[PDB]
């Protein structure tokens with residue numbers, strides 16, 4: 351759809367059998383989710399944002415449905431204050447920015 | 450233009466007589482710029498991100514030209530790793546997200 355940016359761009363995702371909302375974030379390279387129960391094994395990683403860095407667990411080949419669209423990708427799960435869908439998934443659902 | 454997200458969406462801005470590049474960031478409510486010389490009054494502020502909180506100075510009513518569009522608004526100056534254009538200005542230049 352077209353989304354204007356007067357309000358935060360939030361969507362629903364289905365992840366790991368659970369429903370969340372997430373911010374669509376052109377500024378994030380990758381996707382970072384609040385702490386979840388995800389099946390399987392993972393690699394610890396660290397990412398930095400404003401303020402500093404967090405330690406995150408990386409899971410590869412995860413199915414996410416965002417709106418009706420499915421994608422498989424890496425997600426990082428960790429102590430973010432909310433769920434961020436970054437460019438690695440944003441390309442898969444064919445999202446563009448226009449002005 | 451329309452911009453795809455295989456690459457970080459960077460744009461050139463002019464602020465304060467200085468030329469910089471900035472990230473177009475739909476996840477950010479406000480614009481924060483790296484520390485840089487700006488004339489005027491300001492108020493102190495803190496913002497939170499992934500990682501933590503930073504202290505930032507707030508200037509209102511600052512003219513920025515982003516690509517070839519002029520916009521006027523609050524900018525927060527501070528210790529960010531990148532200059533971020535957030536939704537306060539993206540709305541002014543008509544930026545839309547589309548998928």
Ligand SMILES: O=C1N(Cc2ccc(CO)cc2)[C@H](Cc2ccccc2)[C@H](O)[C@@H](O)[C@@H](Cc2ccccc2)N1Cc1ccc(CO)cc1
Pocket residue numbers: 375376377378379380381382397398399400431432434436474475476477478479480481496497498499529530531533535
């Ligand atoms: O830290 C933020 N990251 C950090 C980040 C880094 C990496 C990933 C995964 O690869 C995900 C998120 C981005 C901006 C940024 C990029 C690179 C270096 C430094 C900063 C993000 O793109 C921006 O949207 C918000 C996302 C967000 C928003 C609110 C709370 C937590 C996270 N932030 C923080 C931010 C908050 C407020 C403003 C102004 O209102 C600006 C930025």
